[PDB]
Amino acid sequence: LGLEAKKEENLADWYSQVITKSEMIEYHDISGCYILRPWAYAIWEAIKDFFDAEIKKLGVENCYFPMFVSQSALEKEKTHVADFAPEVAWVTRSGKTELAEPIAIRPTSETVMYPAYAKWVQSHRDLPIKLNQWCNVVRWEFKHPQPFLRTREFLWQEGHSAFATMEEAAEEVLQILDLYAQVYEELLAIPVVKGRKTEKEKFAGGDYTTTIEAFISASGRAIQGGTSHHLGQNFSKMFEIVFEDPKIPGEKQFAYQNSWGLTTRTIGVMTMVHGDNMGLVLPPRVACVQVVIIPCGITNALSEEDKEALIAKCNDYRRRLLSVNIRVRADLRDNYSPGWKFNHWELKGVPIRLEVGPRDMKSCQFVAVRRDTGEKLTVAENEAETKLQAILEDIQVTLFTRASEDLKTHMVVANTMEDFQKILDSGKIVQIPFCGEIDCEDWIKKTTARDQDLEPGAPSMGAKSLCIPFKPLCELQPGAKCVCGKNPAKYYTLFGRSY
Amino acid sequence: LGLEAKKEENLADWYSQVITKSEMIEYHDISGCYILRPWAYAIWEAIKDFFDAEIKKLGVENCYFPMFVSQSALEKEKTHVADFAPEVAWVTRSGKTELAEPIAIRPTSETVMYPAYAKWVQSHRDLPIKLNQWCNVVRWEFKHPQPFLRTREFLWQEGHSAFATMEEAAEEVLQILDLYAQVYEELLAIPVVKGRKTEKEKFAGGDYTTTIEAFISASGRAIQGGTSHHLGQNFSKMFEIVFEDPKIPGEKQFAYQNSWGLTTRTIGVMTMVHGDNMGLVLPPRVACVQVVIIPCGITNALSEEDKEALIAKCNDYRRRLLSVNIRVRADLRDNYSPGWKFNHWELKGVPIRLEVGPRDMKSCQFVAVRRDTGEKLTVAENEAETKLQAILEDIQVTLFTRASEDLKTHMVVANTMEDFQKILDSGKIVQIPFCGEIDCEDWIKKTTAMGAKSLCIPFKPLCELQPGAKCVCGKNPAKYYTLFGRSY
Ligand SMILES: Cc1cc(N2CC[C@@](CO)(C3CC3)C2=O)cc(C(=O)NCc2cc(F)cc(-c3cnn(C)c3)c2)n1
Ligand SMILES: Cc1cc(N2CC[C@@](CO)(C3CC3)C2=O)cc(C(=O)NCc2cc(F)cc(-c3cnn(C)c3)c2)n1
Ligand code: PRO
Ligand code: PRO
Ligand SMILES: [Ca+2]
Ligand SMILES: [Ca+2]
Ligand SMILES: [Ca+2]
Ligand SMILES: [Ca+2]
Ligand SMILES: [Ca+2]
Ligand SMILES: [Ca+2]
Ligand SMILES: [Ca+2]
Ligand SMILES: [Ca+2]
Ligand SMILES: [Ca+2]
Ligand SMILES: [Ca+2]
Ligand SMILES: [Cl-]
Ligand SMILES: [Cl-]
Ligand SMILES: [Cl-]
Ligand SMILES: [Zn+2]
Ligand SMILES: [Zn+2]
């Protein structure tokens, strides 16, 4: 029948079973390449529709840049290329014919886009430039891939803005990060922690990186859900993105830049956070189908005239819901049982199942079964639009509240290395006082791996920084020491085992 | 102060200046690849809106398949692979590490998708499968690229359907071809000829190819606008897309498949067809901005009272046009002159410019300027909504009528090789009685020389083939009238 893999036993096999039986993912014959079937792609589209509308309000415009980079352009920002070079895929021939020059597939589009920005900017009035594109990128790592979360090819949005002043750029970084938090929290019903990446973890070639971190309670691990960088002038100086202002005559000034990105990793996090042992669970805000209508109790005995009346009543509900902007499907096919339909649509995580039997049809009522809790309700026909809308809104709230509770009990403060170690081995993420230096972050990773006390099902790995929270749980006492002991702490920092 | 190159002189240079000064295209530092700036991308989004909605009504669903394909999957259909192999780009290393096996970038996704289709079809009840994707493909030809029309990488949509019976597949082929004709004719105001590709020109690995053909009179050359193929069973026998017959126990049947594609070549044809010596000209149906509002007559003389009232009048036209679902921009920027704006939006082909100066505000009226004809109209204020919509519709009709006249002018019939050659070097396309044989089509190309090629066998030819006509080669009897011409 349905799912038989259990989430609290083997998470990896549960994850693979859920994403395939929900018809979200299919495996491609190339490792780390995954097919996004319609049930998953529609979630990406719901994300796209929301985010596109929001950034359009900010003045951002969509466009499409080439997928290839020249070796010359790829290497102009040395920090950036040093970080990305081992995983850049190279095209070297066409047919059997060697190319003029090997060309790179974009791992990210800074080095594709910024020679164009340098052309388009001549005067102070050519700024700001605010472009976004929905496209695929390729990061050809040889580590083990995981669908949605960590893949060699993925779909994303990347935004790239260039400003005359640091004030404007700084403002945008946080506006975009707020939108990413809205994607996770309002659409996907996933709570996130906003923060700044440490020096170790920031975008190579950027000034600073801001992030949203989500928590996967089944793992005890956290994952970076989205990212908003201030690149400063590090790319404009290397690509000659210069203007002249009459206020500062003669001197050429370098543009201040941001880039920001969000991928289909979103869909994996929603799968990990909300899925259960019956399969996927979709937040109503992104569900391709919010209500599935299924005609029940049909036997051989049912009169043919009665049967037609039943299929017509199911289509009645469908049209009523379509007219109130509820996304809806009537699973009317003859070639599957009611039980098989119940199971099929539960695996796919449809928020509400609408059951219509001949008895309920004739009594002008129906049954609504919520997916998150399995609770059932008998509803009078005349109320369908009203109550279904409310159940949808309650489902969204409930999913978020549950996930918020988990976050609140798995994120705590510790003020010493020993307490940090212990709390971390209990499967939580921890805010600790931290010196910020890259070397101390390496030492933290090394020794929390070394000193790990293994709880039965837990991952065996060192702790990494996640973000410096904008709003820590507590305020740093004056003169507090980092967990390293030898440097004063600069801020509370969230640390955990992570993806 | 705008366009200097003339369309009737060096067309290629006109095209280059129009697509750059309308801020549609930028050159990338890799030869032959182009940046789609927002002005162009927004047209592609309009096309996508229409077409996405329509194919959703047909039961088609969007997905995303990998961009990479393995050697073994690529060569399973021999005809298809042979035709695409010289233009397939190959990834051979990541960083410095040579890859174990080179992997290919998709030129088209039949060989990416159809292994999965074979997994998904378990039974008659798993059909039909109807999938579409909006994505990029690479066809690395070493010939001279041309923005929009012929490019090494381009955005498209590719739809791929598998059915249990040929009757279903055949129906869908024509429904999609009709939607492509609607994109060109209702959205882009470009007339097209529907037809079938000759044996020579049909999609490699398919049984037949339906197409829409457009005509660029500045060139005398035709261009293939969009195509819908019936792949028959050629691919399902190679990739084992099978289901058991519901009535004959044990007998496996091979699914009947179609595929159909439409690319950003659309935008290029729109530019070549409607553009003039002032620049781009947008059909209102796909125009990002349908009406641009431009304040005029601001001087240092004008009082702050008067300037702020003028700006507010502009914003009230903005609100009222947004209210009636006219896509409007108010260009209220102070650091650009009104002349600069007139030029900027003319080059970008905005259908209507709405000028408001102080005296016009004080006369409760404004000036509307149609981009296509250059005609200025004075419009009372209270009529803004209804008049502007009228003009927008008239613009769309006018662009389509002119272009339609052009095609009627440049597509004529001929029944000999002599007049075929005369009318062809006339800069026109000719329907001629044709035998359909490949050797004779090679021959027509060799004789006509740039040689003419076949374009389509029109669904609705201009004349009925009169009983027993012979083909222009002379050796054989004709089988159908066939559209021929020089081609992009
Ligand atoms: C889907 C996706 C999203 C993001 N990121 C990063 C940026 C961010 C942050 O939010 C968003 C754009 C801004 C995001 O989503 C990063 C990757 C990725 O690095 N892919 C390559 C790869 C392939 C592979 F086979 C294995 C591994 C791998 C890595 N460790 N292990 C143990 C295996 C990595 N992939
Ligand atoms: C944008 C686009 C659209 C279509 N197609 C074809 C199919 C169709 C029509 O319906 C749609 C998919 C269904 C369409 O739009 C085909 C190409 C293309 O073959 N590109 C490769 C290339 C690169 C290059 F640098 C030069 C040349 C080249 C070829 N001759 N010359 C004189 C130069 C070719 N490109
Ligand atoms: O890869 C990154 O993280 C940045 C954000 C999107 C574009 N590049
Ligand atoms: O390239 C072509 O012509 C067909 C139709 C789109 C997918 N393959
Ligand atoms: Ca769907
Ligand atoms: Ca690094
Ligand atoms: Ca790296
Ligand atoms: Ca990291
Ligand atoms: Ca130090
Ligand atoms: Ca223990
Ligand atoms: Ca635009
Ligand atoms: Ca070829
Ligand atoms: Ca047999
Ligand atoms: Ca047989
Ligand atoms: Cl299972
Ligand atoms: Cl080359
Ligand atoms: Cl736990
Ligand atoms: Zn420290
Ligand atoms: Zn002949």
Author numbering:
A (entry chain A): 1014 to 1512
B (entry chain B): 1014 to 1462, 1474 to 1512
From the paper:
Among the aaRSs, prolyl-tRNA synthetase (PRS) is a validated drug target in Plasmodial spp and Toxoplasma gondii (Tg). We successfully co-crystallized all five compounds with TgPRS (L95, L96, L97, L35, and L36) and three with HsPRS (L95, L96, and L97), all in complex with L-pro.
However, three out of five PPL derivatives, i.e., L97, L96, and L35, were found to be selective against TgPRS as opposed to its human counterpart in vitro, with enzymatic selectivity indices of 27.9, 13.5, and 8.2, respectively. This is due to a slight displacement of the hydroxyl group and, in turn, a slight downward displacement of the entire cyclopropyl-oxo-pyrrolidine group, sufficient enough to overcome the hydrophobic environment resulting from the exposed cyclopropyl core. This is also evident in the rotameric conformations in Lys1156 and Phe1155.
